Ligand binder design. Structure first.
Ligand SMILES: C[N+]1(C)CCC[C@H]1C(=O)O
Length: 264
């Protein structure tokens, strides 16, 4: 059984994260209160995944779709019939209150930013290969010529205007923040990227100390953070849809398909 196979253990990421709260709810929804959820981090969990995959050792992680892990590995979602992880998750483009009128040109670009999951992986994979994000961003924009035209449609050039982009250091958001960062730099902007945790990121935006962020995962991941700063930020675009999250096992675990299978 799945309980037999993993010793009632889920390998997760960092404790302060959205997927970890959501998992807490999951374990509670499916009556898994004798299970152990290991907190770790992205780096640590993906390493533990690597060990177990190679050995064909059964493992249950907390996975999220917009990530290179589904590329480097044959993985799968355990079905969530109780939808503990919510649904219709999206990546959003947020700014500080009154950025759109302070800088109409920069907001135009930010609101027009869209791309797909594998287009983001185009970047994420090269970065995990050890390529420098700023180089991969440049390579990307000088490759996907038509996509940038979409984004920069009716967008003027500026004389060294300053812009502060706040990002949370998940691999997905290193992808997006750099690509957009580069687009702005090609446009003649003085671009700063400020790294922060989620929370400090939301605060920075809500208190004007950062201009924009491409790290808002709504509505499920940052339910609380979005609520907390309800009338104090701008949501000016969706940069991606169909992002999924939950319990992920490798495909070799044929007999484990639902979270329900853990009750056995
Ligand atoms: C799903 N994630 C791992 C990726 C971005 C948000 C983060 C989380 O808080 O769960």
């Amino acid at each position: 059984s799945a309980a037999e196979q993993v010793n009632k253990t889920i390998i997760g990421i960092d404790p302060g994260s959205g997927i970890m709260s959501l998992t807490d709810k999951a374990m509670k929804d499916y009556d898994l209160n004798d299970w152990t959820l290991i907190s770790a981090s992205s780096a640590a969990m993906t390493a533990t995944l690597k060990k177990s995959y190679d050995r064909k050792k059964p493992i249950i992680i907390t996975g999220w779709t917009p990530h290179w892990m589904f590329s480097r590995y044959k993985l799968k979602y355990l079905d969530d019939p109780k939808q503990s992880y919510g649904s219709a998750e999206e990546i959003h483009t947020i700014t500080r209150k009154g950025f759109s009128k302070e800088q109409p040109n920069a907001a135009k670009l930010l609101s027009q930013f869209k791309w797909t999951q594998d287009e983001m992986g185009e970047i994420m994979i090269k970065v995990e290969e050890g390529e420098k994000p700023a180089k991969v961003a440049a390579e990307y924009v000088n490759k996907h010529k038509d996509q940038i035209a979409e984004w920069t449609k009716g967008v003027q050039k500026v004389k060294g205007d300053k812009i502060n982009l706040a990002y949370v250091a998940w691999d997905s958001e290193i992808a997006s923040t750099n690509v957009i960062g580069k687009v702005l730099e090609d446009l003649g902007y003085e671009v700063t990227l400020t790294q922060v945790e989620a929370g400090p990121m939301w605060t920075a935006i809500a208190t004007g100390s950062a201009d924009a962020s491409l790290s808002a995962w709504l509505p499920n991941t940052h339910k609380a953070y979005a609520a907390k700063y309800k009338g104090k930020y701008d949501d000016i675009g969706t940069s991606m849809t169909g992002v999924k999250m939950g319990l992920v096992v490798p495909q070799y675990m044929k007999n484990v398909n639902s979270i329900e299978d853990l009750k056995k």
